[PDB]
Amino acid sequence: ASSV
Amino acid sequence: SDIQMTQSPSSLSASVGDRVTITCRASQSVSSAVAWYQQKPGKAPKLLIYSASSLYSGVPSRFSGSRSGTDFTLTISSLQPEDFATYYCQQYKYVPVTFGQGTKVEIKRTVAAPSVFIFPPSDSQLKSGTASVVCLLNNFYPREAKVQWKVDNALQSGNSQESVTEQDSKDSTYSLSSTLTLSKADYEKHKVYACEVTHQGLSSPVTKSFNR
Amino acid sequence: TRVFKKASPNGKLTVYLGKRDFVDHIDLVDPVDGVVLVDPEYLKERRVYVTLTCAFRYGREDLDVLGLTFRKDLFVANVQSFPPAPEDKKPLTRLQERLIKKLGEHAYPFTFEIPPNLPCSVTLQPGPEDTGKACGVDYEVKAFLAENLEEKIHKRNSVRLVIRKVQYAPERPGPQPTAETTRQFLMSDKPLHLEASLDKEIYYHGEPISVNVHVTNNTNKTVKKIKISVRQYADIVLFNTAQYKVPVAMEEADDTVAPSSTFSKVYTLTPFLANNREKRGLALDGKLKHEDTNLASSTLLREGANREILGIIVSYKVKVKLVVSRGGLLGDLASSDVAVELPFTLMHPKPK
Amino acid sequence: VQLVESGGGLVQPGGSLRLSCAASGFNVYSSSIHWVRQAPGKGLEWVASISSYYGYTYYADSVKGRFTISADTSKNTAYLQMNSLRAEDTAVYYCARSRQFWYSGLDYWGQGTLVTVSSASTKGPSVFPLAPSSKSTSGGTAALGCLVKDYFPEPVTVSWNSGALTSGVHTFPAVLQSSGLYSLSSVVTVPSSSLGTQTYICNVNHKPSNTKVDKKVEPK
């Protein structure tokens, strides 16, 4: 999981 | 139950030197695992950009990509004669890897009218057993046209196939080939054949009718 | 830019990092910088810690639990992210100062320095009948809240993310691996000269290795076979020292070299994991969970290295053996085989 | 570097056909060979993939159980055995390389071999010339045409005067008819002054049936  | 790719545009039109942007939104979060491809007619696709934003070796510096949640975009600073082709967005986080529908990029030109001509069926065809009239359109832009046949002052439908050639590289125009396929018996009877075209360049629908 | 994110079971802690793979350039390691988001609503202990751990995970043979594993901490470091003690003030990195701006003051920064001469992440291949977690060396960053360093950590008030210390192929290629050996037998002063060399010094994973062989047999003996083999070496230093050689690629060509005659041929091998799945314990590159990773990349140690480096130290060599006829005066008692080895660097090219 | 496809043709439904993709300049174990399917004007579809380093096969659910992907590492060729074929599977099949370490898209593709699946048999074309009459002449320019009909396979190459006349030619795409046999058109614009005093012919060639044609166009 990742996010800006 | 698979991840599909939807390219927001359908058919993009722009002149040489434009900044074009193609958006593509994936079904779910595929992370930064997206690619873009260019396909010329009759040729195999070419990889343009990978990893959503990273440019591939040998691809001009004008192309560039960007991520935004599920929306991935392809951009070009200045549009060149080499860039006029269809484009596809890909994802490759999970299998199966899927592709977008496609965006028809094309050269912009002044709205020209079609040189419509009507051709009767040859003697070699009527002796075989079939009949096929050909209403030809040549040199026109844009490629959106709606030709319709009329035989014995009545709109005939259900037997009219069409074919549109690709945009030329020099003058940048299209052409269309509608063929009214019918039997030999129907040609001799009520012989009042004609084709009626409707284009933006033409203010009124011009009709080309032939007899004998 | 994008950052990796992982939250604790109940969501009160969330670790943020810029990347998972931290490159080891021998002279320096990429620093592990990031932040930890903790809401005041859930902060009752009022002490948040972050810990970097390089541990060797293994299974005991006597125990037949089938999946049970143990860890042994080789290197461990601690950084008190909250409260900020007055005797520690560090400058935030560009990465860190972007994160606080996005999240806010509830994201406390941490930064670890991996010292040199530490092992890289290397996972040992499990068998088909192995359901536990991945064995070998692996790095792990664990954030938690606790009154003090003595207290027992609750698994729900904590979160662990696996990271990897990696290496890549040197930018300059090393010298062409070449090796020779001459064997002389008692029957007469006629030697058996064996000459071998590889095409290049550096090889990327899944690339063909070409071995140029040249044998000059002036002896009364005959070469029955020629056995080429790419072998994986792995020196493991934890409690005392273990080591092993295992052929990951090989070829037993029946090329005969008759007495008083020369021979020259190029053999091509290509190590790959498919035809090595049954080799339990075979070193593989670090695994985050249980994905398929390629054969363990060669670990590069410093020239003036400290040596006795913990963890797993993997190397590669191509062995070129000659099976010789034997017999004669001494019968089959004395061995006459002649072999020579060729070391080479196997690892991924540096990504740009 | 290149990827050469082979093994395309017409096969009836239920039958089988096998593709070959020879590679050059790509190490087999540092790559992952793929197969992609595209019908005319329908878009790309992944169908199969082989990972020769780890030794694994992957297929699209539509293809599961029907096709099988293989590869001879020694010969650097990737095969695809296609069994229980269907009309849906009529398409140009591309072969595409991928970096094993690590996947960064489909960096190279082959020209793709034309695969056609249908119960209708092969048939040669019936070329009838579209004679230019008074309707064709306009603005000091006339147009000659040549119709192509009744042929079934997809590959069909046409050229006016054996490739000598290339100014103004417009080879329209082929379209499939209700009966099943394809139909194609091609026209050229030549000035009206030269018409009559210079002969122009449409040389059509069909490789599956081996039927060369040299029909002459004459004004009606």
Query: Are residue B172 and residue B125 in the same domain, yes or no?
Result: yes
Amino acid at D20: S
3-state secondary structure D26-85: CCHHHEEEEEEEEECCCEEEEEEEEECCCCEEEECCCCCCCEEEEEECCCCEEEEEECCC
Residue C122: burial class (beta carbons within 10 Å; 0-12, 13-18, 19+): buried
Q: In terms of residue numbers, what domain contains C38?
A: 4-166
Query: Are residue B102 and residue B15 in the same domain, yes or no?
Result: yes
Provide the edge-to-edge strand list for the sheet that holds C13-17.
A2-3, C3-7, C13-17, C32-38, C107-112
- Gap from C206 CA to chain D (nearest CA, Å): 5
Cα-to-chain-centroid distance, residue C56: 12
Q: How many domains does chain C have?
A: 2
The set of chains that have 3 or more CB pairs under 8 A with D is B, C
- Check which CATH number belongs to the domain holding C18 and give it: 2.60.40.840
Query: Are residue C219 and residue C320 in the same domain, yes or no?
Result: yes
Structural domain includes residue C77:
yes
Which residue spans within B1-70 are E strands per DSSP?
5-7, 11-14, 21-26, 34-39, 46-50, 54-55, 63-68
Tell me the domains of chain D and their CATH numbers.
2-117 (2.60.40.10), 126-216 (2.60.40.10)
User: Resolution for this model in angstroms, one decimal place?
Assistant: 3.2
Q: Residue C205: its chain D contacts at CB < 8 A? A: 30, 53, 100-101
Query: Are residue C218 and residue C343 in the same domain, yes or no?
Result: yes
Which residue spans within C146-296 are E strands per DSSP?
158-166, 178-184, 191-198, 202-203, 209-217, 223-238, 240-253, 261-269, 283-285
Q: What CA–CA distance (Å, rounded) separates D107 from D147?
A: 39
Please count the residue pairs, one from chain B and one from chain D, whose beta carbons lie less than 8 angstroms apart. 119
Instruction: Please identify, among B52, B85, B107, the residue that sits at the C-terminal boundary of a domain.
Output: B107
Amino acid at C185: F
Query: Are residue C143 and residue C82 in the same domain, yes or no?
Result: yes
Query: Are residue C217 and residue C293 in the same domain, yes or no?
Result: yes
The total of other beta-carbon atoms located within 10 Å of residue C246's CB is 15
Method: X-ray
Cα-to-chain-centroid distance, residue C73: 17
The set of chains that have 3 or more CB pairs under 8 A with C is A, D
Residue D22: burial class (beta carbons within 10 Å; 0-12, 13-18, 19+): middle
Q: In terms of residue numbers, what domain contains B16?
A: 5-107
Phi, psi of C287 (to 5 degrees): -110, 135
**Residues forming beta bridges with residue C257, ordered by sequence position:** C223
Query: Are residue B64 and residue B38 in the same domain, yes or no?
Result: yes
Structural domain includes residue C352:
no
C94's enclosing H/E stretch is: helix C94-103
Query: Are residue C111 and residue C188 in the same domain, yes or no?
Result: no
DSSP character at residue B52: T
Instruction: Please identify, among B107, B140, B166, the residue that sits at the C-terminal boundary of a domain.
Output: B107
CB B85 within 8 A of CB B38: yes
Closest in B99, B122, B138 to D43, CB measured: B99
- Asked if D53 has any chain C CB less than 8 Å from its own CB, the reply is yes
Q: How many domains does chain B have?
A: 2
- Check which CATH number belongs to the domain holding B168 and give it: 2.60.40.10
Provide the edge-to-edge strand list for the sheet that holds C223-238.
C240-253, C223-238, C311-324, C338-343
Amino acid at C175: P
- Which region, left, alpha or beta, applies to residue D74 given φ > 0 means left and ψ of -120 to 50 means alpha? alpha
Structural domain includes residue C171:
no
Buried b (16+ CB within 10 A) or exposed e, B160-180: beebbbbbeeeebbbbbbbbb
Contact D185 B177 (CB under 8 A): yes
Query: Are residue C61 and residue C101 in the same domain, yes or no?
Result: yes
Query: Are residue B101 and residue B128 in the same domain, yes or no?
Result: no
Query: Are residue C102 and residue C12 in the same domain, yes or no?
Result: yes
Query: Are residue C190 and residue C104 in the same domain, yes or no?
Result: no
Query: Are residue C221 and residue C340 in the same domain, yes or no?
Result: yes
Query: Are residue C187 and residue C77 in the same domain, yes or no?
Result: no
Instruction: Please identify, among B72, B107, B142, the residue that sits at the C-terminal boundary of a domain.
Output: B107
Query: Are residue B124 and residue B50 in the same domain, yes or no?
Result: no
- Asked if D140 has any chain C CB less than 8 Å from its own CB, the reply is no
